[PDB]
Amino acid sequence: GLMQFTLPVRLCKEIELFHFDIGPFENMWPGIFVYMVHRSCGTSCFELEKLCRFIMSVKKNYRRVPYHNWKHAVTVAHCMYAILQNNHTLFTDLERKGLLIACLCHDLDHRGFSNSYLQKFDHPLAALYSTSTMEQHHFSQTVSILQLEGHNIFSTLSSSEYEQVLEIIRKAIIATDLALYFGNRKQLEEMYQTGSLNLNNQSHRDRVIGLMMTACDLCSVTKLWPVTKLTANDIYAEFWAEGDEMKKLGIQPIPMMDRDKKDEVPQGQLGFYNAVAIPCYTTLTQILPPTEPLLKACRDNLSQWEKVIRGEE
Ligand SMILES: Cc1nc(C)c(CCc2nc(-c3ccccc3)cn2C)nc1C
Ligand SMILES: [Mg+2]
Ligand SMILES: [Zn+2]
Fold first, then answer.
1. DSSP 253
2. Which of 157, 253, 260, 278 has the most crowded CB, counting CB atoms within 10 A?
């Protein structure tokens, strides 16, 4: 009960900043997460025995793929921690509990392949879940882990709080389907500008939580340049493996997934910052002003990709 987690001084300081990298020491990531729950939620939010046992079962059910791995899980949870800590009073006790778990579980049992590749391969998951295929699987895996003897970190919630938290987590995880981001941001953009945005409207909070999940999910673009650049290698290593597998099915992959077209990565990064990342953190900054540093970091990294094209690196 009186047992805190305490990080070394540099981590204790830097973990509070949006651009924090969780480092190459896998064995510290669970402690880093528990630290974030204790400071975000309280030392009372979960039983430490049950949380530790949930954390390690979640870790086990992430696979050894270049990008959609345990490191991604914890990185995306740290971004949500940063957003929550800079927006103290805007979020209920339940949302703070649900969203850090949502981020940890958001890519559970990812195989390194897009929804499109499951569909063209005719993977069983594509018959079971016709839209947001992997994302319904990720939530399904979250529910399974919560139901292992000793793993129900929500046991001490009422029947109705329990139903509310699983519903926060479900929507949170479904919203990490980037296919749903564009429509969600357009609606949030119209609501902010016409002045109709209302954070007491549950359907409005849902869209805002949705945008936060896209922001934490893309947070690789908001790091210091060297982290951003090295994480891009991992993102493309998966994409190019999927390109390879598309070709084995007799289908030319889109350029993004074709290793033959590596040359075009800088222009592809420009497109992505302009069409997806910058709009995302822009709308997020309007709704939640203290998240401006993510927009600032994203703009700095757009500038770094501009320099790559200009042959300056
Ligand atoms: C978080 C994240 N998510 C995505 C999806 C990407 C891919 C960025 C992209 N590259 C291309 C591209 C690349 C090479 C050749 C042709 C096209 C097209 N697009 C959209 N990058 C990051 C950092
Ligand atoms: Mg995902
Ligand atoms: Zn993800």
1. P
2. 253
Please list, residue by residue across 274-289, b when 16 or more beta carbons sit within 10 angstroms of its beta carbon and e when fewer do: eebbbbbbbbbbbbbe
Whether domain 28-310 has CATH 1.10.1300.10: yes
Spell out the domain ranges in the chain: 28-310
Report whether 83 contacts 216 (CB < 8 A): yes
Residues 6+ apart with CB under 8 A from 51: 34, 37, 153
- Tell me the chain's radius of gyration from C-alpha atoms: 19
Instruction: State in Å: Cα 289 to ligand 1 middle.
Output: 27
Q: List the determination method.
A: X-ray
To test the ligand 1 pocket, which listed residue (217, 269, 276, 294) has its Cβ within 8 A of the most ligand atoms?
Answer: 269
Q: Which residues line ligand 1 (CB under 6 A)?
A: 218, 220-221, 232, 235, 255-256, 261, 264-265, 268-269, 271-272
Q: What is the three-class DSSP state of 199?
A: coil
Q: Are 78 and 32 in contact (CB under 8 A)?
A: yes
Is residue 222 a contact partner of residue 18, using CB atoms and an 8 Å limit?
yes
| Lookup result for tokens 């924090």 | 20
Catalytic residue among 68, 110, 137, 138: 68
Among the bound ligands, the one closest to the CA of 109: 2
